[PDB]
Amino acid sequence: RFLKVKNWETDVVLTDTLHLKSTLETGCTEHICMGSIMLPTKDQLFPLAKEFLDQYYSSIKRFGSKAHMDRLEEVNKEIESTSTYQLKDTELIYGAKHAWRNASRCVGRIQWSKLQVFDARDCTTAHGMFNYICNHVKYATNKGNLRSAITIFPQRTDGKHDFRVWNSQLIRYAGYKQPDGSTLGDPANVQFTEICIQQGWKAPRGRFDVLPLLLQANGNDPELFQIPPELVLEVPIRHPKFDWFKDLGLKWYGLPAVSNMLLEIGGLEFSACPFSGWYMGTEIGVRDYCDNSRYNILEEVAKKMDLDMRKTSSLWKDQALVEINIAVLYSFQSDKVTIVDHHSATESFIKHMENEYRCRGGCPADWVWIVPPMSGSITPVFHQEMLNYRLTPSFEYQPDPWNTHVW
Amino acid sequence: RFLKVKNWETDVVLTDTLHLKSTLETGCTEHICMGSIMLPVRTKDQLFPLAKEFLDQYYSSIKRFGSKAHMDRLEEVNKEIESTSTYQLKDTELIYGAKHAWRNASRCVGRIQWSKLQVFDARDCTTAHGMFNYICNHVKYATNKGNLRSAITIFPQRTDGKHDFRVWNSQLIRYAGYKQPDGSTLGDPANVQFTEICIQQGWKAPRGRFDVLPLLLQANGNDPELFQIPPELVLEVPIRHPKFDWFKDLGLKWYGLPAVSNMLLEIGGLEFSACPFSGWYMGTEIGVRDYCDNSRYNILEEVAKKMDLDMRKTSSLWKDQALVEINIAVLYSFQSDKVTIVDHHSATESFIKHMENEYRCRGGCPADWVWIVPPMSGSITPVFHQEMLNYRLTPSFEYQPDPWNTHVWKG
Ligand code: HEM
Ligand code: HEM
Ligand SMILES: CNCCCc1cccc(CCc2cc(C)cc(N)n2)c1
Ligand SMILES: CNCCCc1cccc(CCc2cc(C)cc(N)n2)c1
Ligand SMILES: C[C@H](O)[C@H](O)[C@H]1CNc2nc(N)[nH]c(=O)c2N1
Ligand SMILES: C[C@H](O)[C@H](O)[C@H]1CNc2nc(N)[nH]c(=O)c2N1
Ligand SMILES: [Zn+2]
């Protein structure tokens, strides 16, 4: 019940006590582990509020103070009266920073406390949402000196007035199915790219077309907006040794900004809460470029390198994969855009674990997602035992809106 | 209850029902996942249900469930248990058991081969010298001049736990490791503790970088004894690179036969504490783990130096680059010497097919993602995008404590 985790490369052992505060469930049982599965009222709400406020007031060292008791009572009264409640600004920021802190799949959490929270709870329309989002993008981008941020739109009420951003990221490339059978641009976004045109977008049918935003305010029909290009920082991808690289026509965007998640704080559900940080290089180079169900460029790069692609055991895929990722990091760094390599990021995460075990009694972590998708065992997280559990406040998945929207 | 897993690369969905027949625990609860935790004297009381469950599986597989043969066997085993507190498996049962333990090994990517396991019954063995002889025959059979064949040798089962057979070596063939007074290590760092034991027991260590350890063998709960595997029986491969002529000068080699010998085979409640087993290597086991783990041979620096890579900023990905060349060398050398080896692309592709096949014909295939995914180039292999259910079936291979920690010395 007071659990141990061993690093197998360094024999370092940490004792986890924090897992006992785990509220939600994991998908696993004593009979089956689901560690690798992608996605396993008034009386409900007051305990949720209390749990949160208790941890809030404990974090500011006023646990069991008049302030605490008062606030606890204040919210208690509000729930009984309004069937919900509102967070003080301070709680909103605390909650968001902590939802990031508790995200077990996130390798970048060492930065958790330096998050800029933009309070967008006074927003009422989709045009307003657009303004807030452009402001977020411009701030976070910061001319390539990236800064973490989240913009928080109003909380769910009766579930009929939901704020939602339909894009999965604020900035993604469009995906169109060709008559010739293959796919142009990004296959992952084919369906969304449809629903854009299907809602009125005029698609340039190019390879790297920044998709428009599809913003839904107060449960209304969602609207289309084009992010000002001057706000969308992009990086043309070149290799520091292969001059033919450029002619592949590859570029990627600087700002990774997840927008389809649900932020949960003290029982409250913020269904529109786009958040951004900066890329780890492998996210673009390994996953975005080389996944079979994505830009799938391996064969072409390898051809250009004149590699023996006859037998899998020449490791030509591996050889190219490395070069591609050297180029991604190279380009980004050249153009002075923030990026981190998987070696540096994983090392920072280990340090972050140390700190969390030391000052918080633990750090929930999902090994399947923390270990980078290349060179797994030459990064230190590979050899690091991790305990995965769910703490709140949290970010959670939610259904795509098109499947849900009462049109 | 039905359960579905999805492959996110192909959207292929499968349904697991096999997990219902799962007996043992996982280590996970509803509130915690221990999926990346590495390691998460039995009475007649608990034994017969285990025997019956085994015998039931066995007789289903040969299409004789409920037959008189089935019923007599259950009767026979029942009687022998209460009579003698244990029981002996027929040869057919031992074989079925050992294959299935492999078949149920959720961390094993090479399971497509499971039905083709040569089982050597060593249950008549009484001494350590007898153990040495059996193991030598195993090594020679499995090696087959480089054309490797899967085998397991099975020594007598545990009785009162005071008379255990154990192979003290973690693998039948492994390189010695020696801690130097300056704190550096010569040879394989993973094997320092074991090497010291051997030296203590009287082994004369040549003290080089690739010394094949002696076998340290315990029969019938007696003190272990030392034996030197005849060198002519140990196949080794000099490592060279197909393009880098300086690679050979690094002075690297590895052995051809991966043969694990410190695990415990559990069949129908019986416990086989000495059951060395072998197959052939996936290239990354040597190339990524054995050579490039920081706590192993750790040759990344020197390979990268010789490649004259930019070793100043890690964002040069020099580590990744050297890692690939090193793994290219391992595969090239093995194929060149005609010693069976499989690359991680081929191995993972085959496991996916095996896995799908097992869902259709068995109703599931327990698999441990953390261990199935290769330690380099994870996401460009198909297992990365494959959801998997982990659960424990019997028969199974289990960990057991190192015997130097439990042994009662006779002197
Ligand atoms: C600052 C640099 C950051 C880096 C390098 C980073 C990196 C990553 C990576 C590689 C993943 C794996 C998911 C995937 O590969 O698709 C991930 C997941 C995640 N990140 Fe971070 N991230 C950063 C910032 C943030 C911020 C600012 C937030 C929220 C405020 C955040 C929240 C999350 C969450 C909730 C997940 C997992 C979502 C899920 O359950 O799938 N991250 N991150
Ligand atoms: C024939 C070719 C085989 C290949 C390529 C193969 C490959 C592997 C690999 C790479 C691992 C991961 C372990 C590590 O990385 O340290 C593994 C685990 C395992 N293998 Fe196989 N294997 C083969 C045959 C066998 C055989 C013949 C047996 C037993 C009869 C077996 C039983 C196991 C077991 C029980 C584990 C997991 C051990 C644990 O719980 O840590 N494998 N296998
Ligand atoms: C595929 N699983 C769901 C994807 C949703 C998601 C949530 C959080 C992060 C990511 C990866 C994109 C990303 C986002 C952020 C803020 C930083 C980063 N480095 N990378 C995806
Ligand atoms: C401390 N326990 C050491 C043994 C752990 C282990 C069990 C099973 C397989 C392995 C990997 C070595 C191996 C064994 C076999 C039979 C085949 C193979 N490719 N690779 C390690
Ligand atoms: C802590 C972590 O589970 C440990 O390092 C595991 C990770 N996955 C692995 N996978 C394989 N095949 N072999 C290993 O030794 C390990 N080690
Ligand atoms: C099925 C498996 O869970 C799936 O492929 C996961 C594996 N680990 C991952 N890890 C990261 N960082 N990102 C991912 O998208 C995935 N996908
Ligand atoms: Zn689990």
Whether residue A34 lies within 8 A of chain B, CB to CB, comes out as yes
C-alpha span between B188 and B375 (Å, rounded): 19
Closest Cα of chain B to A147: distance in Å?
21
Residue B279 in contact with ligand 2 by CB distance below 6 A? yes
C-alpha span between B337 and B332 (Å, rounded): 9
Work out the angle between the directed axes of helices B318-336 and B300-307 (0-180°, nearest 10): 100
Which residues sit opposite B260 in a β-bridge? B171, B277
Query: B191 with B323, same domain?
Result: no
Interface of B with A in 359-378 (CB under 8 A): 369-370, 373-378
A382 assigned to some structural domain: no
Query: B306 with B361, same domain?
Result: no
B133 to A388, B153, B154, B277, B279: CA distances (angstroms): 47, 11, 13, 15, 20
The two three-digit tokens of residue B347, written as one number? 């191995």
List of long-range contacts for B181-190, beta carbons under 8 Å, 24+ apart: B187/B211, B188/B290, B188/B296, B188/B297, B189/B295, B189/B296, B189/B297, B189/B298, B190/B295, B190/B296
C-alpha span between B320 and B314 (Å, rounded): 10
Nearest to B324 by CA among B402, B229, B242: B242
What amino acid occupies position B218? Q
B72 to B49, B50, B55, B69: CA distances (angstroms): 16, 17, 11, 5
Q: Report the residue from B30, B283, B289 with minimal CB separation from A28.
A: B30
Residue of B nearest to A319 (CA): B324
Whether residue B192 lies within 8 A of chain A, CB to CB, comes out as no
B242 to A79, A91, B40, B115, B324: CA distances (angstroms): 72, 61, 42, 35, 13
C-alpha span between B397 and B242 (Å, rounded): 38
Going by the annotation, the residues of the binding site of B for heme b are 108, 399
A49 to A95, A158, A236, B155, B406: CA distances (angstroms): 12, 18, 47, 61, 52
Structural element, H or E, at residue B345: helix B344-362
Work out the angle between the directed axes of helices B44-61 and B91-103 (0-180°, nearest 10): 90
Spell out where chain B is interrupted, by the residue before each break (C to N > 2.5 A): 40
Q: Could you give the count of Cα atoms lying within 13 Å of A290 in the half-sphere of its Cβ? A: 30
Q: Say whether B295 and A9 touch across the interface (CB within 8 A).
A: yes
Q: Could you give the count of Cα atoms lying within 13 Å of B153 in the half-sphere of its Cβ? A: 27
Q: Say whether A35 and B369 touch across the interface (CB within 8 A).
A: yes
| Chain B residues closer than 8 Å to A321 by CB | 377, 380
C-alpha span between B93 and B64 (Å, rounded): 13
C-alpha span between A180 and A169 (Å, rounded): 28
Work out the angle between the directed axes of helices B318-336 and A316-334 (0-180°, nearest 10): 170
In chain A, the number of structural domains is 3
Q: What residues contact residue B16 under an 8 Å CB cut-off, 6+ apart? A: B2, B3, B4, B5, B359, B363, B364, B365, B389
SS3 B395: coil
C-alpha span between A306 and A28 (Å, rounded): 46
Task: Assess contact for B99 and B115: CB atoms under 8 A.
Answer: yes
Interface of A with B in 233-292 (CB under 8 A): 281, 286-287, 290-292
Q: Report the residue from B294, B324, B391 with minimal CB separation from A9.
A: B294
Query: A303 with A339, same domain?
Result: yes
Task: Assess contact for B341 and B282: CB atoms under 8 A.
Answer: yes
Is beta strand B166-167 parallel, antiparallel or unpaired with respect to A268-270?
unpaired
C-alpha span between B358 and B354 (Å, rounded): 6
| Chain A residues closer than 8 Å to B324 by CB | 315, 318-319, 322
Question: How many residues in chain B?
Answer: 411
What amino acid occupies position A135? N
CA A160 to centroid of chain Cα atoms: 25
A307 assigned to some structural domain: yes
Distance B278 CA to ligand 4 centre (A): 8
A330 assigned to some structural domain: yes
Task: Assess contact for B114 and B102: CB atoms under 8 A.
Answer: yes
A171 assigned to some structural domain: yes
Distance A107 CA to ligand 1 centre (A): 7
- The dihedrals phi and psi of A49, each to the nearest 5 degrees, come to -60, -45
Query: A31 with A104, same domain?
Result: yes
Tokens 């180079």 locate to: A285
- The dihedrals phi and psi of A263, each to the nearest 5 degrees, come to -90, 125
Task: Assess contact for A102 and A392: CB atoms under 8 A.
Answer: yes
A289 assigned to some structural domain: yes
Whether residue B38 lies within 8 A of chain A, CB to CB, comes out as yes
C-alpha span between A17 and A59 (Å, rounded): 17
Instruction: Specify burial of residue B401 (Cβ count, 10 A radius: 0-12, 13-18, 19+).
Output: exposed
C-alpha span between B128 and B403 (Å, rounded): 15
The two three-digit tokens of residue B266, written as one number? 């559990």
B165 to B194, B258, B403: CA distances (angstroms): 18, 21, 10
Residue of A nearest to B26 (CA): A30
B381 assigned to some structural domain: no
Is beta strand B177-179 parallel, antiparallel or unpaired with respect to B185-187?
antiparallel
Residues A184-202 as b or e (16 or more Cβ within 10 Å = b): bbbbbbeebbbebeeeebe
- When scoring A22, A28, A379 by the number of chain B Cβ atoms within 10 A, the one with the most, hence best to mutate, is A28
Nearest to B288 by CA among B245, B331, B236, B339: B331
Phi-psi category of residue A83: left, alpha or beta, with phi > 0 → left and psi -120 to 50 → alpha: left
Query: A29 with A154, same domain?
Result: yes
B39 to A385, B27, B35, B400: CA distances (angstroms): 10, 9, 10, 10
Which residues sit opposite A252 in a β-bridge? A235
Task: Assess contact for A274 and A259: CB atoms under 8 A.
Answer: yes
C-alpha span between A229 and A210 (Å, rounded): 9
Task: Please give the positions of B annotated as active site.
Answer: 108, 111, 280, 285
> What does the H/E/C string look like for B31-86?
CCECCCCCCCCCCHHHHHHHHHHHHHHHHHHCCCCCCHHHHHHHHHHHHHHHHHCC
What amino acid occupies position A77? K
B389 assigned to some structural domain: no
What is the per-residue DSSP string for B246-305? TSGGG--EEES--EE-S-EEEETTEEES---EE--EEHHIIIIIIHHSTTTT--HHHHHH
- When scoring A191, A298, A331, A378 by the number of chain B Cβ atoms within 10 A, the one with the most, hence best to mutate, is A378
Residue A112 in contact with ligand 3 by CB distance below 6 A? no
C-alpha span between A204 and A211 (Å, rounded): 10
Whether residue B40 lies within 8 A of chain A, CB to CB, comes out as no
SS3 B237: strand
Query: B286 with B245, same domain?
Result: yes
Which residues sit opposite B121 in a β-bridge? B154
Query: B352 with B246, same domain?
Result: no
Query: A201 with A310, same domain?
Result: no
Query: A268 with A219, same domain?
Result: no
Nearest to B127 by CA among B17, B249, B221, B51: B221
Task: Assess contact for B84 and B99: CB atoms under 8 A.
Answer: no
Running DSSP on this structure, what letter comes out for residue B7? B
Query: A25 with A87, same domain?
Result: yes
Task: Assess contact for B343 and A315: CB atoms under 8 A.
Answer: yes
Q: Could you give the count of Cα atoms lying within 13 Å of B280 in the half-sphere of its Cβ? A: 25
Count of CB atoms situated within 10 Å of the CB of B209: 16
C-alpha span between B142 and B236 (Å, rounded): 14
The two three-digit tokens of residue B170, written as one number? 């973690």
Whether residue B27 lies within 8 A of chain A, CB to CB, comes out as yes
Closest Cα of chain B to A10: distance in Å?
8
Task: Assess contact for B273 and B400: CB atoms under 8 A.
Answer: yes
C-alpha span between B197 and B179 (Å, rounded): 13
Range of the domain at B224: 124-149+164-235+399-403
Residue B113 in contact with ligand 4 by CB distance below 6 A? no
C-alpha span between A317 and B380 (Å, rounded): 8
SS3 B25: coil
Nearest to B25 by CA among B401, B392, B396: B392
C-alpha span between A390 and A25 (Å, rounded): 6
> Resolution to 1 decimal, in Å?
2.0
Whether residue B346 lies within 8 A of chain A, CB to CB, comes out as yes
Spell out where chain A is interrupted, by the residue before each break (C to N > 2.5 A): 40
Residue of B nearest to A344 (CA): B314
Query: CATH number of the domain that B184 lies in?
Result: 3.90.440.10
Distance B369 CA to ligand 2 centre (A): 14
C-alpha span between A58 and A64 (Å, rounded): 8
Query: B355 with B323, same domain?
Result: no
Q: Say whether A322 and B319 touch across the interface (CB within 8 A).
A: no
Running DSSP on this structure, what letter comes out for residue B169? S
Q: What angle do CA B235, B238, B240 make, to 5 degrees?
A: 145
Residue B282 in contact with ligand 2 by CB distance below 6 A? yes
Running DSSP on this structure, what letter comes out for residue B243? S
List of long-range contacts for B244-251, beta carbons under 8 Å, 24+ apart: B244/B306, B244/B307, B244/B325, B244/B329, B246/B306, B247/B303, B247/B306, B247/B325, B247/B329, B250/B299, B250/B302, B250/B303, B250/B306, B251/B209
Count of CB atoms situated within 10 Å of the CB of A399: 11
Residue of A71, A101, A109, A238 marked active site: A109
The two three-digit tokens of residue B168, written as one number? 């003290």
What torsion do the CA atoms of B386, B389, B395, B399 make, to the nearest 10 degrees? 90
The two three-digit tokens of residue B273, written as one number? 């504490």
Ligand 3 atom, smallest distance to A108 CA? 19
Residues A22-55 as b or e (16 or more Cβ within 10 Å = b): beeebbbbeebbbbbbeeeeeeebbebbeebbeb
C-alpha span between B166 and B264 (Å, rounded): 9
Strands (E), B192-263: 215-218, 225-227, 236-238, 253-255, 259-260
C-alpha span between A175 and A305 (Å, rounded): 27
C-alpha span between B236 and A18 (Å, rounded): 49
Method: X-ray
Ligand 3 atom, smallest distance to A278 CA? 19
Which residues sit opposite A280 in a β-bridge? A340
What amino acid occupies position A127? H
Task: Assess contact for B106 and B383: CB atoms under 8 A.
Answer: no
Task: Assess contact for A375 and A342: CB atoms under 8 A.
Answer: yes
Query: CATH number of the domain that A304 lies in?
Result: 3.90.1230.10
Q: What angle do CA B402, B406, B411 make, to 5 degrees?
A: 110
Nearest to B34 by CA among A269, A147, A387, A20: A387
B100 assigned to some structural domain: yes
Query: B106 with B35, same domain?
Result: yes
Is beta strand B13-16 parallel, antiparallel or unpaired with respect to B264-267?
unpaired
Task: Assess contact for B175 and B187: CB atoms under 8 A.
Answer: yes
> What does the H/E/C string look like for chain A?
CCEEEEECCCCCEEEECHHHHCCCCCCCCCCCECCCCCCCCHHHHHHHHHHHHHHHHHHCCCCCCHHHHHHHHHHHHHHHHHCCCCCCHHHHHHHHHHHHHCCCCCCCHHHCCCCEEEECCCCCCHHHHHHHHHHHHHHHHHHHCCCCEEEECCCCCCCCCCCEECCCECCCECEEECCCCCEEECHHHHHHHHHHHCCCCCCCCCCCCECCEEEECCCCCCEEECCCHHHCCEEECCCCCCCCHHHHCCEEECCCEECCCEEEECCEEECCCCEECCCEHHHHHHHHHHCCCCCCCHHHHHHHCCCCCCCHHHCHHHHHHHHHHHHHHHHHHHCCCCCECHHHHHHHHHHHHHHHHHHHCCCCCCHHHHCCCCCHHHCHHHHECCCECCCCCEEECCCCHHHCCCC
Closest Cα of chain B to A313: distance in Å?
6
Ligand-binding site membership of A12 (annotated)? no
C-alpha span between B241 and B409 (Å, rounded): 47
How many Å is the Cα radius of gyration of chain A? Answer: 23
C-alpha span between A184 and B370 (Å, rounded): 34
- When scoring A18, A36, A294 by the number of chain B Cβ atoms within 10 A, the one with the most, hence best to mutate, is A36
Q: Could you give the count of Cα atoms lying within 13 Å of A305 in the half-sphere of its Cβ? A: 22
C-alpha span between B228 and B233 (Å, rounded): 11
Residue B387 in contact with ligand 6 by CB distance below 6 A? yes
C-alpha span between A339 and A333 (Å, rounded): 7
| Chain B residues closer than 8 Å to A317 by CB | 345, 377, 380
Neighbours of ion ligand 7 (CB under 5 A): A 28, 33, 35; B 28, 33, 35
Tokens 């196949």 locate to: B235
CA A328 to centroid of chain Cα atoms: 20
Residue B362 in contact with ligand 6 by CB distance below 6 A? no
The two three-digit tokens of residue B86, written as one number? 């244990």
Query: CATH number of the domain that A89 lies in?
Result: 3.90.340.10
